Each structure stands twice: as structure tokens, then as C-alpha cells.
Enzyme design. Structure first.
Site: not given
Ligand SMILES: CC(C)C[C@H](CC(=O)NO)C(=O)N[C@H](C(=O)N[C@@H](C)C(=O)NCCN)C(C)(C)C
Ligand SMILES: [Ca+2]
Ligand SMILES: [Zn+2]
Length: 252
Positions: A183-184, A187, A193
């Protein structure tokens, strides 16, 4: 067309004193083995993703260096460092404010961050209200982009992110930790999101559940959990296309 010579984002991986003690059991071998296996599992998700739903695949991540901080960073009164013993701004709390920690890490690692595609901090602190990580991008992300810090009085680079493997007083499952870092790094690769308003990008539990870029960490057992949505793919596809030639390298 994917350039095999420019398809890998090399990472500087940093394990702080908290991670070394609580995850690595005070051992270098245990610490590095955990991180090497985690990044390799995250790399499988990236490498197997077809960003254009066709032949634009094979892009991933590889560890270039693992820095292991065995003990807390000694600081002078009033001075702060991401690896100091106490949390900031509230020393009575187990964890730092996550945004301030990412800013501090970026400041302290600036010199090293300028020489790598991404820098990622692995820590062991219980961020308030269930937070697991934070990262720049998706204004930063892959490939060092300078930001002059007026408070810091120097350039820092926004090619950073962080993962904590502690949540609600316990070590998270490795299946959960893999999703945090995915997820990180998502980004960092340019994804925002997944919004509720686009069903294709945020499906119901019987339609396979949520994709990795959903803002809420929601279990890890559903089909879509370890995959990027079409919303994330569109954003990352545009990032890779302009950033690969800038700082990506050949897979080792
Ligand atoms: C890997 C996850 C998706 C990262 C995000 C934060 C984020 O979106 N960073 O990039 C998170 O920590 N989300 C938390 C989360 O869902 N944590 C779970 C594990 C939780 O602790 N549950 C909270 C229920 N009251 C929030 C902040 C929404 C509470
Ligand atoms: Ca927490
Ligand atoms: Zn997020």
C-alpha cells in the site's frame, strides 16, 4: 515499451532500533531475513501486474541496502532524530505522530535518499487509531524530488515511506505486513486511495473485496486484497511511463 534495463526501483531499507529489538529479536540475521522475504513477496505483486492490462508488466522493486540501527540515536536536548529512544511530539506515547515521523526520517536520510529510487523505514510502534504506514506520492514518490525545508534549512527528498509491524499492542501477521508495504509503495508509485464511489475499484465482499489501495486495512483473506485496482493501475501506469527512465535500473 518496457525497458528491461530500466524496470526496477532499487530501495534503501532502514530498520530502526524498535524494529531490530521487537521484530529482529536483537539479531541482524533475523532482521534482514524478515525484510528480504517481505520485499520479495511485495515485488511479486508489482512484477506480475500489467499496468495497461496488456504487456506493460515486469516492473518491480529490489533491496540495494539494508541499514540496521541496533540502538537508539543519542540526541542533544531539544534535538530530534527518527531513531531516537523517545516518541515525538508526545514522549508518554508508544509512537510518534506518523506524519512528523515520515518528515523526520526524510530529513535525516536526505543524503542517502538522493542516491536511490526509494527509501523505506521499517519500525515497531503503535500509531494512534490503527494507522500502519505513510508515504509520499499519490509531490514525491519514486525518484528523489527535492523539497527545500525552511525549518530544516536544507533540501530533503520526497522518495520515502514507512511501515510499522505493530498495531493495537501486538505484532501484525506477515500477510498483513506485506499489504502495508504494498500500500505505501503504491502511494510512492503514484496511486491514490480507491474511492467508494467507483464500484470497479472498491468492490463488495462477495465480488472479491477491496483492492490494496483501499484506505482501510480490511483483513487480508479476500481475493482482491493483494491486487491493485484499475484506478491504481491507471495512476501507476502514468508514473512508470515518466519515471522509469529517470531512476529505474536493471533487475539484479
Ligand atoms: C495499509 C493500510 C490500508 C494503511 C492505512 C493508512 C494509509 O492509508 N496509509 O497509506 C491505515 O493505516 N489505515 C488504518 C486501518 O485501517 N487500520 C486497521 C488495521 C485498524 O487498525 N482498524 C481500525 C478500526 N477502528 C486507519 C487509519 C483507517 C484506521
Ligand atoms: Ca496502531
Ligand atoms: Zn494510504
Amino acid at each position: 515499451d518496457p525497458d528491461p534495463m530500466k524496470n526496477t526501483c532499487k530501495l534503501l531499507v532502514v530498520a530502526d532500533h524498535r524494529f531490530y529489538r521487537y521484530m529482529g529479536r536483537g539479531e541482524e540475521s533475523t532482521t534482514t531475513n524478515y525484510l528480504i522475504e517481505l520485499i520479495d513477496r511485495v515485488d511479486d505483486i508489482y512484477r506480475n501486474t500489467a499496468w495497461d492490462n496488456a504487456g506493460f508488466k515486469g516492473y518491480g522493486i529490489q533491496i540495494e541496502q539494508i541499514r540496521i540501527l541496533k540502538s537508539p540515536q543519542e540526541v542533544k536536548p531539544g534535538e530530534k532524530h527518527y531513531n531516537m529512544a523517545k516518541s515525538y511530539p508526545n514522549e508518554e506515547k508508544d509512537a510518534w505522530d506518523v506524519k512528523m515521523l515520515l518528515e523526520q526520517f526524510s530529513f535525516d536520510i536526505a543524503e542517502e535518499a538522493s542516491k536511490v529510487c526509494l527509501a523505506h523505514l521499517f519500525t515497531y510502534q503503535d500509531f494512534d487509531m490503527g494507522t500502519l504506514g505513510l508515504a509520499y506520492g499519490g509531490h514525491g514518490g519514486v525518484c528523489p524530488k527535492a523539497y527545500y525545508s525552511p525549518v530544516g534549512k536544507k533540501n530533503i527528498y520526497l522518495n520515502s515511506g514507512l511501515t510499522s509491524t505493530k498495531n493495537y499492542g501486538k505484532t501484525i501477521l506477515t500477510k498483513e505486513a506485506d499489504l502495508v508495504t504494498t500500500h505505501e509503495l503504491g502511494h510512492n508509485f503514484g496511486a491514490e486511495h480507491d474511492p467508494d464511489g467507483l464500484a470497479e475499484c472498491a468492490p463488495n465482499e462477495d465480488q472479491g473485496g477491496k483492492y490494496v489501495m483501499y484506505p482501510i486495512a480490511v483483513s487480508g483473506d479476500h481475493e482482491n486484497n493483494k491486487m491493485f485496482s484499475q484506478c491504481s493501475k491507471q495512476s501507476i501506469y502514468k508514473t512508470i511511463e515518466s519515471k522509469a527512465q529517470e531512476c529505474f535500473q536493471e533487475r539484479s
